[PDB]
Design a protein around this ligand. Structure first.
Ligand SMILES: *[C@@H]1O[C@H](CO[C@@H]2O[C@@H](C)[C@@H](O)[C@@H](O)[C@@H]2O)[C@@H](O[C@@H]2O[C@H](CO)[C@@H](O[C@@H]3O[C@H](CO[C@H]4O[C@H](CO)[C@@H](O)[C@H](O)[C@@H]4O[C@@H]4O[C@H](CO)[C@@H](O[C@@H]5O[C@H](CO[C@]6(C(=O)O)C[C@H](O)[C@@H](NC(C)=O)[C@H]([C@H](O)[C@H](O)CO)O6)[C@H](O)[C@H](O)[C@H]5O)[C@H](O)[C@H]4NC(C)=O)[C@@H](O)[C@H](O[C@H]4O[C@H](CO)[C@@H](O)[C@H](O)[C@@H]4O[C@@H]4O[C@H](CO)[C@@H](O)[C@H](O)[C@H]4NC(C)=O)[C@@H]3O)[C@H](O)[C@H]2NC(C)=O)[C@H](O)[C@H]1NC(C)=O
Ligand SMILES: *[C@@H]1O[C@H](CO[C@@H]2O[C@@H](C)[C@@H](O)[C@@H](O)[C@@H]2O)[C@@H](O[C@@H]2O[C@H](CO)[C@@H](O[C@@H]3O[C@H](CO[C@H]4O[C@H](CO)[C@@H](O)[C@H](O)[C@@H]4O[C@@H]4O[C@H](CO)[C@@H](O[C@@H]5O[C@H](CO)[C@H](O)[C@H](O)[C@H]5O)[C@H](O)[C@H]4NC(C)=O)[C@@H](O)[C@H](O[C@H]4O[C@H](CO)[C@@H](O)[C@H](O)[C@@H]4O[C@@H]4O[C@H](CO)[C@@H](O[C@@H]5O[C@H](CO)[C@H](O)[C@H](O)[C@H]5O)[C@H](O)[C@H]4NC(C)=O)[C@@H]3O)[C@H](O)[C@H]2NC(C)=O)[C@H](O)[C@H]1NC(C)=O
Ligand SMILES: [Cl-]
Ligand SMILES: [Cl-]
Lengths: 207, 209
C-alpha cells in the first residue's frame, strides 16, 4: 500500500471561522490484508481525534482509506509537524509521512494593480492584472471584487519562485471593454499569513 | 501487476528552436526480474523507424527495472502533427502495449502580446517590474524572453501557461530592473516564439512615458 498526505486549503488556515484539515490517504490496500490502522502525531505527540472516512473502492484492485485530522490554526501557522503513521499487514514496517507549513521567516506580499495596455483597448474584452510578489510561504488566495460583489471571470497563475526565495503570481480578470470604460472600481484581494488581518485589498479604475 | 508505459513529448523550447533537439521519450516501469527484457518498436504515422536510442535497463530502488527509449523527432514533423507510437513488448504482458503521442490537436491560435509598465506604487521602490502579458494562444507550447538594445535581458521569470476560460492559454513574464534604469526612457522588449506566429516569432517593446 502507498501513503499520501495533504495540507489544508490556504483560506481555511487564515480564517478563524473556518476549519483547516490535514488528509492522510492510503491506496493499493489488498483484500487479503484490508485492515488499516492510523496513528496521528503532532510534533511527535499522539492525538486521537482524527475522523476516519468509510473506504471507497471504484474500481481497480485495491482500496484507499482516508483519515482527516482537524488542525489548530495556531499550530499549523507555527510550523508544527503532522505525522500520519499507517499500519497494515502487507507492509514490512509501518509507513510514516510528515507534513507542515513551509519553514522560514514569513514575508508579506506586495500587491500592485495594472490596467489594460493601450493595444488591448482595441479589443472587445480587456484584462485587469493583479501582480502579487515577495511573499513567503507560497500559500495564498487571490480573488476579485467589484461593487461589493465577487467578480468571478478571473484566472490566477500558480506561485512562481523568485530569485530571493520568495514567490510571485499574477491574477487576470477579464471584463467587457465598455464596462471598464465609465470608471467602475475593480478590486484585487489577497489573503496571506503575513498580512495584517491576513488580508489586503487594492483597487483599480479607469483614468 | 505488470509493466507500465508512459510516453513523453519534447520540451516546448526544443520544438521551437532550430538549434535544439526535440525528443520523444518512451518509459517503461515495473519490469520484473523474471521478465526483464523489453523490446521497443517505434512508428511515425504508422511507418516503422529504426533510429531511436534505447538505454540499458536500470534497477530502481524499489527492485524493479526502468527502461527508456528516446526518439529524435524532426522539427517540421512534430509541428505538422505526425503521430509517434511506442510499442513495448515484454514477456509478462498478454499483448504488446502501445502508446501514441503527437502535438496537441485543437485549432492553433496566435498569442496576443501586451507590455505593461510598473504601477505607480511600485515606483517608490528601488527595483521595479516590467510585465509581459501573453494570451489567447494554443497550443500551450511557447517560449518567452526579454531584450534591451540587441541584447538578452536575463533578470526575468515567467509563469507557466494557464488555461483560460475559452480554452486558450495565457501567461505572464516579469522582468526586474533598477528604477533609475527604467527612468531615463530605455527600451525593453518582450519576445515570444510560438508555432502560430508569422516566422514563429513576435516582439513588443516598452519604454518610459
Ligand atoms: C488503484 O486505483 C487507485 C485510485 O485511482 C484513481 O481511480 C482510478 C480508477 C483511475 O481513475 C486513476 O486515474 C485514479 O487516480 C490508484 O490511486 C493513485 O495512486 C497514485 C500513485 O500510486 C497516487 O499518486 C499521487 O497523487 C498525488 C496527487 O493526487 C491529488 O490529485 C489528484 C488529481 O489527479 C487526485 O485524484 C488525488 O486524489 C489527489 O487529490 C487531492 O486529495 C487531497 C486529499 O483529500 C486534497 O486535500 C484535501 O482537500 C480537501 C478538499 O475539501 C472539500 C473541498 O474540495 O472543498 C470540502 C468540501 O466540503 C467538499 N465540497 C462539496 C461541494 O461537497 C469537497 C468534497 O469532498 C468533494 O471534493 C467534492 O466532490 O471537499 C480539504 O481542503 C482538505 O483540507 C485537504 O487536505 C486535495 O484537494 C486534492 N487535490 C486535487 C487536485 O484533487 C501526488 O502528490 C503524488 O505525486 C507526488 O509523489 C510522487 C511519487 O509518489 C512524485 O513523483 C511526485 O513528483 C510528487 O512528489 C512530491 O512532490 C512534492 C513537491 O512538489 C513534495 O513535497 C513531496 O514530498 C513529493 N513526494 C515524494 C518525493 O515522495 C502522486 O502523483 C494517486 O493520488 C492515487 N489516485 C487517487 C485518485 O487516489 C492506484 O494507484 C491504483 N493502483 C495501481 C495502479 O496499482
Ligand atoms: C518503482 O520506481 C519507479 C521509478 O520511480 C523512481 O524511483 C523510485 C524507487 C522512487 O524513488 C520514485 O520516487 C522515483 O521517481 C516508479 O516509476 C513511476 O511510475 C509511476 C506510475 O506508477 C509513473 O507515474 C506517471 O507519471 C507521469 C508524469 O511523469 C513525469 O513526471 C514525474 C513527476 O511528476 C517524474 O517523476 C517522471 O520522471 C516523469 O518526468 C518526466 O520524464 C520525462 C522523460 O524523462 C521528461 O521528458 C523528457 O525530458 C528530457 C530532458 O530531461 C527531454 O527534454 C525530452 O525531450 C523529454 O521527452 C519530462 O521532462 C519529465 N517531467 C518532469 C520532470 O516533470 C504522469 O503523467 C502519469 O499520470 C498519468 O497516468 C496515471 C496512470 O498511472 C494517471 O493516474 C494520471 O492521472 C495521469 O493520467 C493521464 O492524464 C492525462 C492528462 O491529465 C491524460 O492525457 C490526456 O489524454 C486525452 C485523451 O485520452 C487528451 O489527449 C488530453 O489532451 C490529454 O491531456 C492521460 O490519458 C492519462 N494517462 C493515463 C490514465 O495513463 C503517471 O503518474 C512515474 O512517472 C514513474 N517514475 C519514473 C521516474 O519513471 C514505479 O512506479 C515504482 N514501482 C512501484 C511498484 O513502486
Ligand atoms: Cl483552532
Ligand atoms: Cl529537424
Amino acid at each position: 500500500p502507498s501513503v499520501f498526505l495533504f495540507p489544508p486549503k490556504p483560506k481555511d488556515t487564515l480564517m478563524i471561522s473556518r476549519t483547516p484539515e490535514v488528509t492522510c490517504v492510503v491506496v493499493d490496500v489488498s483484500h487479503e490484508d484490508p485492515e488499516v490502522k492510523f496513528n496521528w502525531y503532532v510534533d511527535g505527540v499522539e492525538v486521537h481525534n482524527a475522523k476516519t472516512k468509510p473506504r471507497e473502492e471504484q474500481y481497480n484492485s485495491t482500496y484507499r482509506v482516508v483519515s482527516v485530522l482537524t488542525v489548530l490554526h495556531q499550530d499549523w501557522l507555527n510550523g508544527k509537524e503532522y505525522k500520519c503513521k499507517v499500519s497494515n499487514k502487507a507492509l514490512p514496517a509501518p509507513i510514516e509521512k510528515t507534513i507542515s507549513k513551509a519553514k522560514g521567516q514569513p514575508r508579506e506580499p506586495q500587491v500592485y494593480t495594472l490596467p489594460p495596455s493601450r493595444e488591448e483597448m482595441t479589443k472587445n474584452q480587456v484584462s485587469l492584472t493583479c501582480l502579487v510578489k515577495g511573499f513567503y510561504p507560497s500559500d495564498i488566495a487571490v480573488e476579485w471584487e467589484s461593487n461589493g460583489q465577487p467578480e468571478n471571470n478571473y484566472k490566477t497563475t500558480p506561485p512562481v519562485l523568485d530569485s530571493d526565495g520568495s514567490f510571485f503570481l499574477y491574477s487576470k480578470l477579464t471584463v467587457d471593454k465598455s464596462r471598464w470604460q465609465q470608471g467602475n472600481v475593480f478590486s484585487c484581494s489577497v489573503m496571506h499569513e503575513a498580512l495584517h488581518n491576513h488580508y489586503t485589498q487594492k483597487s483599480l479604475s479607469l483614468s
